[PDB]
Amino acid sequence: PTRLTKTRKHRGNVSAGKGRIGKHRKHPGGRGKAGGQHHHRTNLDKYHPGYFGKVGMRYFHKQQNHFWRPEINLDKLWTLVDSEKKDEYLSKSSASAAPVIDTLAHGYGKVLGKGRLPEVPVIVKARFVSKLAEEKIRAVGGVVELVA
Amino acid sequence: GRDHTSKQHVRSGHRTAPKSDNVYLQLLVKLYSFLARRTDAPFNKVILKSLFLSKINRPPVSVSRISRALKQKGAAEKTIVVVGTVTDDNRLLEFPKATIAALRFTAGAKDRILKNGGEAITLDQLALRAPKGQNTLIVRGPRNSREAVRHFGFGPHKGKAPRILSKGRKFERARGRRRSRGFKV
Amino acid sequence: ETLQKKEKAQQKTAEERAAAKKVRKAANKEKRKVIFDRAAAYQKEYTEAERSVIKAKRDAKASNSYYVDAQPKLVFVVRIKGINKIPPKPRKVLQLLRLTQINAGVFVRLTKATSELIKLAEPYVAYGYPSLSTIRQLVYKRGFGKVNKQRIALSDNAIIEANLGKFNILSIEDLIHEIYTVGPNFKQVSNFLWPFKLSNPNGGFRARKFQHFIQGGDTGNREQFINALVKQMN
Amino acid sequence: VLKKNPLKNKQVLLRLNPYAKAYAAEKVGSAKVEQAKVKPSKGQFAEVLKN
Amino acid sequence: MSQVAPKWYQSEDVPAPKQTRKTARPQKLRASLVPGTVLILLAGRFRGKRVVYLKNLEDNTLLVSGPFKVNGVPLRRVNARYVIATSTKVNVSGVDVSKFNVEYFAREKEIKAERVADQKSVDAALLSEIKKTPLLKQYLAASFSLKNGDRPHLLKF
RNA sequence: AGCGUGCUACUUAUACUUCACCGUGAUUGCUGUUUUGACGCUUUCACGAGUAGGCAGGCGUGGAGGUCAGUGACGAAGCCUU
RNA sequence: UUGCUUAAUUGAACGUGGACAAUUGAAUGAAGAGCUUUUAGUGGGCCAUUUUUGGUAAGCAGAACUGGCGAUGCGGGAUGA
RNA sequence: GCCUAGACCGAGGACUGCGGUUUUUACCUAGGAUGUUGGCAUAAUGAUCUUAAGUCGCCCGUCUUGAAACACGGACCAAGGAGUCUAACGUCUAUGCGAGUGUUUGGGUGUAAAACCCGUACGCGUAAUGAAAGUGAACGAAGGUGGGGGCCCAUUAGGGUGCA
RNA sequence: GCGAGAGACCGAUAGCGAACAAGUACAGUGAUGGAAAGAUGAAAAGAACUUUGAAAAGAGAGUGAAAAAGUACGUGAAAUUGUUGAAAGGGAAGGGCUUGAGAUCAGACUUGGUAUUUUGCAUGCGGUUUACCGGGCCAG
């Protein structure tokens, strides 16, 4: 609402809060990102270091679909197990019958190894796993099954 | 005339009331304004101040934070007090039986507390079974984990997060972030 | 029928108040005897010290000697200069003396630290050695205490007891005695005392204030003439 | 509600200082000092008159 | 004025006054005000008249008579602050003023027969004592006024 | 009624002292008498200059939802007027 | 305790355990101390005392510290930042 | 210690306090003015307007170190007349839900641009780092030390637990 | 362009330049440029007639709810102006503060209580004046 703006409170004061010497002018200092190496260096160097220059090699025609690989950690891995059957799986899982967790069908490409698993066998199907993620899965009696 | 040794006509700088106009939060302030004024219990004076806090000053308390506080020695049967929202944590492997008083519970939080044999009560229910906050334990959420705090106090060699819209190799990584491009700060 | 309800409540609470006041007055009678005895003892020791000093002077005169008075241990400092155009160091010194207005008075125990303080504020204050009657009149007419950072009139000995009983000050005369013969709790008693807010002199100042008392002005040490100055201003 | 000067209001003076009553009763404000009529300056203190 | 309605908490009851501790004490009169003193009236109808002071009433007023035959000033009350107390005095020990008080001069043209009788009885003794001092009756029958060069701060009365 | 100097009294600033009132900041207490206002009432103390500028609390205007079963041709709005 | 140091069982740093209690180690003051975020205007200055440079000097130009004017009314200096 | 002249003020509004005099749970000058009398109610009293008198008072706005300036605009009056809207954002605050969140592109529906209902994707968040190939977050009760509000046991003090 | 329905939009210096005989009047050789300008009243009932005047008009009169609505048209501000009344005024005027003077305004004999006198009405209601209680204001 306009009735809440400070333009309404500056009515009656000559300069409208802009100052009498400095005044409000068209574009003192330039337009946009002007002067970034000469008189706005002190701003860009302090608050946006790394702005000027090239780093790394180009990549012509980069298709971001190639690099699609959402991550899931181990402390969130049992959330892909059916909610209505999680407690049963946590009890009756053994080497002979362990729950299967299809991570790709839930939208994940790589299993990472943050956190701790229940000491319960699981079958994890993944496109990729980390070295430590697979070591933690085997310790609880599980296995990693590679898929594509 | 006076030679003023301090600034004149200075407000305290602390909230004396909620900024919120929610009438039901006001009723809670009504109750603990009376309790803090009359019990000499330090718990009630803390609760009254905490009811004034803004949303960022009452960060959410995960159900995992409560579990670690109940795992303190001799704190297993204390009443957990959260002036704010209690959220769920799907990274927990197990939750104990506990009594928790909070402003709000999430669907997962209310389910989990009651699933494990506990209680999920409001802060007015606390004031009857513990009008002095006896055998309680106040839990506060992490304040410095907010995303806005990443950019606070940014400067050369400060290690804070730049205020930037896109992230990548072409975005503020060359000159001033690299000795091969001049200097590094 | 609320008339008879409120009348019954008033008479019941009046009776309870009467009994409690009877007990309170009986207990306070002993305290008032204590402060009476204290005041009488203070008067006796004042007189004894005066007569002792007089006798020592007479004896030294008789015995071909010279009695040198003990240097004064107490001083009363009045800020007689306005609040404009004061250099930072004397300004800070005057602020630390709680002299933040013209005609504000404070009690200072003379040592070296406080003497060098007053020397820094000397061009802006008139100070001197206050007599017992001057202290009494100041405390009686313009005596205020700092209670919860508020300036409260010293209209009852209960205020003084409630604020200085841990320092063995139970009366206005205990406070005056503690000030005059500079006592072990001078610091607490003088800081509890709000800075005295005096009027201008009846009869005016000298023709020009802001020059030393020695040169015909008003600043600096005027000593026993601080009593006349206080008599003018209080 | 209204500060009263104990130097003007006698009741307030007695409220603050009960010994003022004895001071009035004993005439402490005009008490005599008992001593002999002596003059101990007859000797060397006459160095004040001349040198 | 505006459209602001009275609220329920806006009470109309009138509080009682606090208990006042202004216990009245008797009037102090000037040492020059002694019964029998000749007074000068400064204000009122009988301004400038020299009159005899008789009694101090309980109204803080002074009972005064001319006497009426000499002056035309009857028995009445005056205020002590509208009076010059001279140094001339008349012996009024032989004048009975017992019956005179505030209720005598109560407000109810004409004049009471009692008042006329009292006027004559008082004036008889007043005249008897006045005759002893020569020119005192003439002095009382003459009005007072300030002449040119009269300084009341320097005159003795 | 000039110059140097001393003395007595006297003159008056929005300054100082006491007091009234306004506002700001703090403060005492207020639910078995909280009692149809607790965003409220109450006790006490200190303070109050201000361009550029910030903020707060308010006054007024066109139009909109709701409400006053509001005013009004027995006179709305507008306009003039110690 | 150590992977450092010493010829060393020497030291260095960080420690366990024990002793020293309100005169717990000067004064004075303290409308309390500490902390964070965000943003306005400004970025022509000038003056007085004192220190002071160039210049014959300047109501000139330039510095140091403080206080002021600017941004400020009120009493005095008739008048005057 | 005592006597004495004048001026200004009267805030508060049942009681509650501290004292004094105590002849007495009597009275008082002791937590803020009462008593009495006269006059007036066709009015004494108060306010405003106009005007006289006394005293002070330069033309506003602006740029400026400095303006009443011999600096600029303004003869007068009425009406109009200048920090807006939008895309994308920072801080702070309120609200809903919360490891998720966002119905509105679209579909359903409708008393039809409203309201009501639906869901796949997608955006942001839930992982970072490296130029990249790539790799990818528990020694320990998710660590130790000194503080730390609150809480627990105590009994000045003291001990335990100690979120942010 | 054609045909419709709408709006937290503007309300005759606004809204399109144009609500009207508006791309009109008018300018420029020309390309082009380009206004101002809505409102009597329900109804002309748009003032017959008489009279003065050369006439426009005026004065009577008439219509009308209104002529304080006459096409100079509802309402009719200010600048500016006439008349009447009041005041002030020695090379400006105007202002603040204060009081005087004049004018204007305000307010307690209250919803005053007690009975009387004394009268209009539907045993009772309001008024009035005399007594007492007490109150308001200005003062001693």
Ligand SMILES: [Mg+2]
């Ligand atoms: Mg403002």
Ligand SMILES: [Mg+2]
């Ligand atoms: Mg402003």
Ligand SMILES: [Mg+2]
């Ligand atoms: Mg301004």
Ligand SMILES: [Mg+2]
């Ligand atoms: Mg302007």
Ligand SMILES: [Mg+2]
């Ligand atoms: Mg301005």
Ligand SMILES: [Mg+2]
């Ligand atoms: Mg601004």
Ligand SMILES: [Mg+2]
């Ligand atoms: Mg400008």
Ligand SMILES: [Mg+2]
């Ligand atoms: Mg600028």
Ligand SMILES: [Mg+2]
């Ligand atoms: Mg360059």
Ligand SMILES: [Mg+2]
């Ligand atoms: Mg993509």
Ligand SMILES: [Mg+2]
């Ligand atoms: Mg002030």
Ligand SMILES: [Mg+2]
């Ligand atoms: Mg983070």
Ligand SMILES: [Mg+2]
């Ligand atoms: Mg973290």
Ligand SMILES: [Mg+2]
């Ligand atoms: Mg001091």
Ligand SMILES: [Mg+2]
């Ligand atoms: Mg004098």
Ligand SMILES: [Mg+2]
């Ligand atoms: Mg003098």
